[PDB]
Symmetry: C3
């Protein structure tokens, strides 16, 4: 199924019939970072399998729901169960849920992910406000927009220079300062590694030479689809490890260590994003 | 349809029956840079849709013609309507028209494109004679030659060290000096960004570190297919903007600004390439 | 056909019925470097076309056999006729023979390849023990593991930091010292160029900046599939040329020069790997 105007419209019509919520804000949460979705007020849960034209996610399994409701007095829509390109999903499958958000009225998209640290200042448990990216799949002819352009949504050749909104970054930092955890918050450039193997030690050393601060396997495809159709983005990485220190010391990484860092920071991240939602313009 | 010897032969046979021209020179022109095609003498226009085994271009639409005729007393064939890989065309679709040129007798291919400047010496409106390239799709398993080798056309493992002919570069520069616009002409290395998003600010900074002078979304696939089958190439970029200055100043880019630069330089480029065609060995 | 547990099991069952060999060691040899396979004792030759679920290799042609038998008193299985991703084989086709090795009992995989030298210390005819890699296809969403994870074989997110076993590297070096050819043996980082074009002169200069020692078009996909399922790896490059010197001097390369270097070093490499097999733990 193509992520075109007709197919996105059919999905949006179903959601409006079931939900009664017109959301202004969309959220996509990283693994182990989804507690906020469970606290959405007056919520409505819509399994992806119920929605016309949503991608099929049964080969990978696990949860897959849209959740609509209220947080801090604002109307929101969340993806619970994220689609990643290393799983084999196509460009069209990644893009269709974001374009449905657009048709439902979303103007701001908030995103979190787990990432490896490249900048020497970064420690396990730190946060990075993403200010730009290096898209290795895009340079190499696997951009999420390869294919015919869907002109109803945006232009053939988008400019990404303002993909990461400056004022949203400033608001996130302001809340951290108000609550005395600004020492955990950095800004940086995110490198997209298609995955699913972690960056090798010598790949990490290369990324340090090229001016990357963090590296991960998500986020950039959704940012590009949002920017193409005029949705503002805030994206925050939680640092699982420093890959440069690990390379210099011959130390390993695994999904278990990543998820333990996620559990340590989950409650703070939930509170931070609730406050951002409450206050964003 | 595969870009093999039998399929290219059927297309070439049709063209020879309709056209009566055996061309020595092929041209592919960048967007807004096609005026020369409209001045071809004794011309014959052959829509792609009429030619056996030519790729289907109706999803993207717009013009798609082969034009044969004379320029400066030389016999030429032009592609009017270029195929780009960010549109979703396959390796085989890009390659078949160049291999048909080979079977028609083409020995030299002249190419223009619009590009972003990375080298700090480059200004909007400058020209760059391409002397080499950095092929990010090729390094990343999306080379135009991935697939079975078509042995009738060239070798399994081509060498690209002489893909950009030195004497053709010298002749282009000589004509610029004769007519007092050599101050606009540079030489440089072209980075292939698969696209269709413009290079991000942080991607531009990376390309500066890696020794690239210009960046764009075309040209390298056609150069590789031509080199594989023994066709000499001259490739010239028109600089739409300096992406490094734009990153340092927080300034944006769009297809409209690009096309305005193309209109400013269109007549000079037409005259330059007419003179190159007249004089090349 | 997917490289899953059921499909690999059917292939392994056929091989055990025909062969009577349970191998501990697997080998994959570079082009012109396969003499050792011809010296396997008490050997059994099984064409790929005879084995359930093995990939179809008739479009490319040439040899394609599994060979089982004894070398130096150890039980081995060799791939005679290597599958390369520049030929158009999919992720699943590359992976299935390595996963069949796993099910047959292989614990160690030995690999050779032909490569271009980037480090200035490297000369034609030198050997490089690979200690790490830079996987441009992997960074760019063409990793061999893109797709559903086959959980019976390994984890969703593998760590590659110990993909190249340290003790196997030490043993290879020890044998070279015992026989007075250690002056030919280096260690280094391997860059994977998807191919099939040789690295361009300006790509070679980029790889020098990024800390690569050698560049080639194979090996990394098989290393990743082996590491994912717990097989230890030794990988050795034979240097055909120095691509940096060739770029500075305007000198070319071709498959013929590569194969002449292979013929010069073939007998030494056969003797070296026979001794490694005899002595590895
Ligand atoms: Cl991350 C964060 C965000 C907000 C607070 C806070 C201090 S007072 C108060 N009334 C409701 C929220 N709130 C603390 C931490
Ligand atoms: Cl780009 C260019 C190329 C040629 C000329 C020129 C000066 S005299 C003359 N007779 C015909 C062409 N021609 C000027 C500019
Ligand atoms: Cl590459 C290599 C490997 C081994 C030797 C060697 C010296 S004595 C001896 N008995 C059998 C093998 N062998 C020489 C060269």
């Amino acid at each position: 199924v193509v992520a075109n105007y007709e197919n996105a419209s059919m999905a949006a019509d179903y959601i409006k019939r079931v939900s009664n919520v017109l959301p202004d804000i969309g959220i996509i949460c990283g693994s182990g970072l989804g507690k906020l979705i469970e606290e959405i007020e007056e919520r409505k849960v819509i399994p992806y399998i119920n929605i016309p034209n949503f991608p099929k996610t049964t080969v990978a399994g696990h949860v897959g729901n849209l959740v609509l409701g209220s947080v801090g007095g604002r109307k929101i829509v969340a993806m619970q169960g994220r689609l990643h390109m290393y799983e084999g999903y196509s460009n069209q499958e990644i893009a269709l849920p974001i374009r449905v958000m657009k048709l439902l009225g979303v103007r701001v998209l908030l995103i979190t992910n787990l990432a490896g640290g490249i900048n020497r200042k970064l420690k396990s448990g730190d946060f990075v406000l993403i200010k730009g990216h290096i898209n290795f799949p895009g340079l190499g002819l696997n951009n999420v927009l390869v294919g015919p352009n869907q002109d109803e949504f945006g232009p053939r050749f988008p400019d990404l220079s303002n993909a990461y909104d400056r004022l949203l970054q400033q608001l996130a930092l302001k809340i951290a300062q108000e609550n005395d955890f600004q020492d955990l918050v950095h800004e940086g450039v995110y490198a997209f590694n298609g995955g699913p193997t972690y960056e090798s030690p010598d790949e990490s050393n290369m990324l340090l030479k090229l001016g990357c601060d963090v590296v991960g396997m998500s986020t950039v495809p959704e940012v590009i689809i949002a920017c193409h159709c005029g949705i503002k983005v805030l994206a925050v990485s939680l640092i699982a490890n420093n890959s440069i220190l690990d390379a210099e010391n011959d130390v390993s990484i695994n999904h278990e260590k990543v998820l333990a860092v996620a559990e340590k920071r989950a409650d703070l991240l939930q509170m931070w994003f609730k406050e951002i939602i409450t206050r964003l313009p």
